[PDB]
């Protein structure tokens, strides 16, 4: 019998890094899951599962919520079973899931003279990454027999790169903030149900 934590996460200065997603669990509370759909402040909204206006009778028990900031034109790579040459190397999602992803503008706060350079993203560490797993590999990419070990030789380049955006953002390449929720129903007691 308490207010849900949904109001303590939205409208935050920062959430996490590009290659760092934090999983959170919703505490016991009572609320309606159709409030987000009624809101007109989320222009972008895409997902799979029951319709927003009907997913109320079947109360969820398990909630997995993540939030991050990415490039605006990455919506093409946010889809189930994606086989993009870059997406799988950083993020991957399976087709057997029921959940919804929303995105909105991120330039309202991440704007200043000289652009933004705090965000970093990886390119390649060893091979394609399976979904639901992360690793921190500091080893430099190897493209030959002699181990460069940080030497700028044999195509040994730094795998991580930072964003760059001018305050005069034009085309939709400007960064966006993306939040993804997944709901799982089980016979175990449900934290939220009514």
């Amino acid at each position, epitope marked *: 019998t308490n207010l849900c934590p949904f109001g303590e996460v939205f409208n935050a200065t920062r959430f996490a890094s590009v290659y760092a997603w934090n999983r959170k669990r919703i505490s016991n509370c009572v609320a309606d899951y159709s409030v987000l759909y009624n809101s007109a402040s989320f222009s972008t909204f895409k997902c799979y599962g029951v319709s927003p206006t009907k997913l109320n009778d079947l109360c969820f028990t398990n909630v997995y919520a993540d939030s991050f900031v990415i490039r605006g034109d990455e919506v093409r790579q946010i889809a189930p079973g994606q086989t993009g040459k870059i997406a799988d190397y950083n993020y991957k999602l399976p087709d057997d899931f029921t959940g919804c992803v929303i995105a909105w503008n991120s330039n309202n706060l991440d704007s200043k003279v*000289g652009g933004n*350079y705090n965000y970093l993203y990886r390119l390649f560490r060893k091979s394609n990454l399976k979904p639901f797993e992360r690793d921190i590999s500091t080893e430099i990419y190897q493209a030959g027999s002699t181990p460069c070990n940080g*030497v700028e030789g044999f195509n040994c380049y*730094f795998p991580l790169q*930072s964003y*760059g955006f001018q305050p005069t953002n034009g085309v939709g390449y400007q960064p966006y903030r993306v939040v993804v929720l997944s709901f799982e129903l089980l016979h175990a007691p449900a934290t939220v149900c009514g």
Partner: nanobody
Amino acid sequence: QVQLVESGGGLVQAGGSLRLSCAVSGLGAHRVGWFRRAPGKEREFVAAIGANGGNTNYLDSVKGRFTISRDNAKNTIYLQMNSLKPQDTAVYYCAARDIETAEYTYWGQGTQVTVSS
């Protein structure tokens, strides 16, 4: 574009701090580094600093009082060789980290400062 040039140098008997800066016309979100000119047919890596300033790397003979930092106003770059001794030779190569697509690729220069007994 970004203009990289280096010209100067000079040194005296062992004394206080020594400061040389590789001229750069601002670095917004692009890398820059220094290359060791070892006695061989190829150069060697020295250090690389990202835009965020993290992931700092140094050679086996650089850990210690030597440090490098960046400024948010004019991207001023500090150098090593603080509290020198009459045994070191100072010749580097400024590198623009040609892996980038700002306008083009550019190459820096360096000096041959030396010490005296």
